[PDB]
Design a protein around this ligand. Structure first.
Ligand code: BCG
Lengths: 220, 218
């Protein structure tokens, strides 16, 4: 059962420090050469650093733009690799993925889920959540409801509907940033026979501020 | 640095047909050890990249038989024997010969399907938002195809352009449609100075804009 799980990201001050971790399991970590790749709009996927295995003297290699600022390291006894990031810049903002080359010629075979790093002096702010219910009477066959999530920072927020029980007719859109901070919409379409007879609630979480909010969509 | 080029920024394909994606390197990726270090990855919308093919033609574990790769030196091709609607995503090639490792810019696979008009819904500001001094009017243009659409907002018939926040979803992996959210951001004071709020969508499926509107006074 192979998995790589990154932790340690989130909002960080420009010029500040942050150390990402990545825990491996399900494969022989000690033989693998392990790398960090990040993604940004502007470069797409970008290789960051690599640390080799003990047999290859744990050697490290870094991309030019982070050399001297980032340090990659590993602790085979905990099957983990780390990326200590110093002197953080806006160009360092992106999703960072832990990935490994388990054996010679295998390529980046296993990847973690990714951890968003946002290099910004702005501060963490919770979201407000507003139900979006139809103006008129339904009918017809299907009705669309929504939840407006606004005023939060940084990304991401997770939105579910009926705690996950409704997912097939949901579109949670990318958030938009402007003066009010982030603003995101999520819509859900269900039969007119489901709502308003059944409770439809959107559940919003914002891990940065540890905010959780459940809002029921009620006919207006 | 070695430069990886994926000319096509996207490629449109109909489910059931075969298709190929090309990648070129600026240097031969053939190593002294005899292996060619070129791999292919898929990144579905909102997920991490995942390896599809390592060293030109070797399928990775769990990858569908429909994928294959070929190529040599500086030119490579990823092929699908039969595409499926769930194949939407961005496909990247990467050279793993020299440091720094480098990736192509990716080619987005776009599934072609029958045209579909948007289901357009408009929402007056929630009373909860109004008590807080806010008046965002939200409009969803959902499940439409092809992907381009235009949205115009009108307040008592006059067009409004500033304060509009637009967001688009990636192509749906099950039904190959696209959706868009458009929010007109107003303060409560501004909201009350007028009464007609319309979200008008123009899309290839109709010669007439699709209009959804309401009146504040109701
Ligand atoms: C061109 N080579 C060089 C540099 C990139 C690529 C890669 C590869 O050859 O697979 C490297 O080695 C590994 O990543 C590896 C070796 C043993 C065990 C686990 C991983 C060796």
């Amino acid at each position: 059962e192979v998995t790589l799980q990154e932790s340690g990201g989130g909002l960080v001050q420009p010029g500040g420090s942050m150390k990402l971790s990545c825990a491996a399991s399900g494969f022989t970590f000690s033989d693998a050469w392990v790398d960090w790749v990040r993604q940004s709009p502007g470069k797409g996927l970008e290789w960051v650093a690599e640390i080799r295995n003990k047999a290859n003297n744990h050697a490290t290699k870094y991309t030019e733009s982070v050399k001297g600022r980032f340090t990659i390291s590993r602790d085979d006894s905990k099957s983990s690799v780390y990326l200590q990031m110093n002197s953080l810049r806006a160009e360092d903002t992106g999703i960072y993925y832990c990935t490994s080359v388990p054996q010679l010629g295998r390529g980046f075979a296993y990847w973690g889920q990714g951890t968003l790093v946002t290099v910004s002096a702005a501060s963490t702010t919770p979201p407000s959540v507003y139900p979006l219910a139809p103006g008129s009477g339904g009918a017809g066959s299907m009705v669309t409801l929504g939840c407006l999530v606004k005023g939060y920072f940084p990304e991401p927020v997770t939105v579910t509907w009926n705690s996950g029980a409704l997912s097939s007719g949901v579109h949670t859109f990318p958030a938009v940033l402007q003066s009010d901070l982030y603003t995101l919409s999520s819509s859900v379409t269900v039969p007119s026979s489901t709502w308003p007879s059944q409770t439809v609630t959107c559940n919003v979480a914002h891990p940065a501020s540890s905010t959780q909010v459940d809002k029921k969509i009620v006919p207006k | 640095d070695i430069v990886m080029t994926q000319a096509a920024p996207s490629v449109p394909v109909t489910p059931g047909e075969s298709v190929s994606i090309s990648c070129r390197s600026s240097k031969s990726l053939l190593h002294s050890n005899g292996y060619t270090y070129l791999h292919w990855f898929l990144q579905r919308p909102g997920q991490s990249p995942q390896l599809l093919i390592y060293r030109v033609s070797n399928l990775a574990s769990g990858v569908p038989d429909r994928f294959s790769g070929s190529g040599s030196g500086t030119a490579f091709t990823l092929r699908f024997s039969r595409v499926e609607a769930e194949d939407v995503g961005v496909y990247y090639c990467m050279q793993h010969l020299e440091y720094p490792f480098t990736f192509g810019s990716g080619t987005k696979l776009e599934i072609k399907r029958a045209d579909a008009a948007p289901t357009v819904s408009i929402f007056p500001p929630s009373s909860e938002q109004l008590t807080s001094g806010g008046a965002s009017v939200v409009c969803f243009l959902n499940n439409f195809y092809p992907q381009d659409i235009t949205v115009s907002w009108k307040i008592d018939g006059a067009e409004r352009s500033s304060g509009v926040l637009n967001s688009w979803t990636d192509q749906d992996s099950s039904d190959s449609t696209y959706s868009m959210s458009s929010t007109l951001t107003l303060t409560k004071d501004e909201y009350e100075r007028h009464s007609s709020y319309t979200c008008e969508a123009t899309h290839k499926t109709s010669t007439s804009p699709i209009t959804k509107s309401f009146n504040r006074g109701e």
